Amino acid sequence: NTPKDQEIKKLVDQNFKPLLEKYDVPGMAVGVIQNNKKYEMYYGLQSVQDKKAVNSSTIFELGSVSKLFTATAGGYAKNKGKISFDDTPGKYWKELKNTPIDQVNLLQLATYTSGNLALQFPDEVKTDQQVLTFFKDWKPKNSIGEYRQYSNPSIGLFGKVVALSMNKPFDQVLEKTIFPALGLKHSYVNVPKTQMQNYAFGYNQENQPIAAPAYDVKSTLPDMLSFIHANLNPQKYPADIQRAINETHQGRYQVNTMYQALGWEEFSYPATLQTLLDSNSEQIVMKPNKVTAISKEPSVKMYHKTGSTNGFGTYVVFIPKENIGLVMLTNKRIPNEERIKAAYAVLNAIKK
C-alpha cells in the first residue's frame, strides 16, 4: 500500500529532516541498507554559496569514523600475518624499542588502554618527527591495560604500526589495499584535484564554510553504504578482507553495557536507546573508565560509531541479524545524541 522505498524515505523525513532546521545544517546524506537493498536520501547543499545540492557524489569528512578503516586495516595485516595484536610498537617502529610506550601492545593501543593517552595530540604535534618525539617522551600513568580512555593518538600509533608492517604509507594502505578490497571507489585520505568539485564545504557553528598520523578519511554515502554492506556480509568478500572485517567485530572488553571492538562500539541487540546514548556520554568519551572482561558474549549484537570534524558529522550503525544498517553524513556538526536518537527511531520503525 506504500512501497518500501517510500516508507523508509518517510521515516528519514520524520526523524532526520527536522535536524536540518533545528541545527541549521546546510546538507545531509542519510542511507539505509536493508536485506542488501540500499536507500539513499540527500538533503540540502554541499556548498551553500555555490547552491550545489548534496547528491550521490558528495564527499564528506568522516572524522573519527575513520578509525573504523584503521581498525579494518589492522585486522587485515593481522590475518595476513603482518602483525600480532600481542606485539609492541617497537617491533615495527624501531625508534620506539626500549621506550616506555614499548610496554603497550597493539591491541591495547587500538582499544585505548595504554593508561596515559589523551583524546587528541597536543596542538603543536604536527611534524611526523614530533609524533615520534611525543611517543618517545611518553610515560605510563594508570596501569597499562586497565583503563579505557578514548584517544586518537592511541589508535593513531596503532595505524602507524599497521602501515609499517605492510611497508607502505598509511594512506596507501587504505587507498591501494583496503578501499579496493571493500569495493569503495570514492573514499580517500587525500581527495584528488579532479574530485574537489564534489568535496563538500564543512560549516562551523556560525555556518561559515571552513599531521600524517592524523588518519582521516573522506567518503560518499554510496561508499559508506557499501562499507556497511561489507560489515553486514563479510562472507561475500575475499578471505583476507573477510577476516579483517570479522576481526573488527570481536568485542575485546566491556565498559558497562558497551563492548569495545576494533574501532566499532558493540552492544547486545536489542539495545535500549539509553545504552546507545551512554556510549557517547562525557563519562565514557572524555574520562578514563576501568574495563572489565566480557562476561556475556553477545550472540545477537549491533555496532555503531559517531564521528565529527569541525565542519562535519557522521554516524554509522548496523545490526547483522536484522540485515540492516544506516549512515548519516552532514556538513555541520550536530550533537551525537541527536544522531543516535534519529537512527534508533528509523531503524526500529522500518518494517522487518
Residue numbers in the entry: 1 to 210, 219 to 360
What do the authors of the reporting publication say about this deposited model?
Class C Acinetobacter-derived cephalosporinases (ADCs) represent an important target for inhibition in the multidrug-resistant pathogen Acinetobacter baumannii. The class C Acinetobacter-derived cephalosporinases (ADCs) play a significant role in antibiotic resistance in A. baumannii. β-Lactamase-mediated resistance to β-lactams can be overcome using combination therapy involving a β-lactamase inhibitor coupled with a partner β-lactam antibiotic. Many ADC variants have emerged, and characterization of their structural and functional differences is essential. X-ray crystal structures of ADC variants in this study provide a structural context for substrate profile differences and show that the inhibitor adopts a similar conformation in all ADC variants, despite small changes near their active sites.
Additionally, ADC-33 and -219 contain a Pro213Arg mutation and an alanine duplication a few residues prior to Tyr221. In the apo X-ray crystal structures of the variants (resolutions ranging from 1.24–1.89 Å), the Ω-loop conformations show more variation than in the complexes. ADC-219, another variant with an Ala duplication, shows weak electron density throughout the Ω-loop, and residues 211–218 (SANC 210–217) were unable to be modeled into this region. Perhaps most interesting is the structure of ADC-219 in this region. The Ala duplication (Ala218, Ala218a) of ADC-219 are the first residues observed after the completely disordered region (unmodeled residues 210–217) in this enzyme, and the alanines are out of register with those in ADC-33 and -212, with Ala218 of ADC-219 overlaying with Pro215 of ADC-33 and -212. The most striking downstream consequence of this shift in ADC-219 is that Tyr221 is not observed in its standard orientation forming the base of the active site of the class C enzymes. Instead, Tyr221 is reoriented approximately 5 Å from the position in ADC-33, as measured between Cα atoms, although electron density for the Tyr side chain is not observed. This shift of Tyr221 results in the side chain of Asp222 occupying the space left vacant by the tyrosine residue. Whereas most of the sequence differences between the variants occur prior to Tyr221, ADC-219 is the only variant to contain a sequence difference after it. The higher B-factors in this region of ADC-219, as well as its weaker electron density as compared to the other structures, suggest a more flexible, mobile loop that potentially samples multiple conformations.
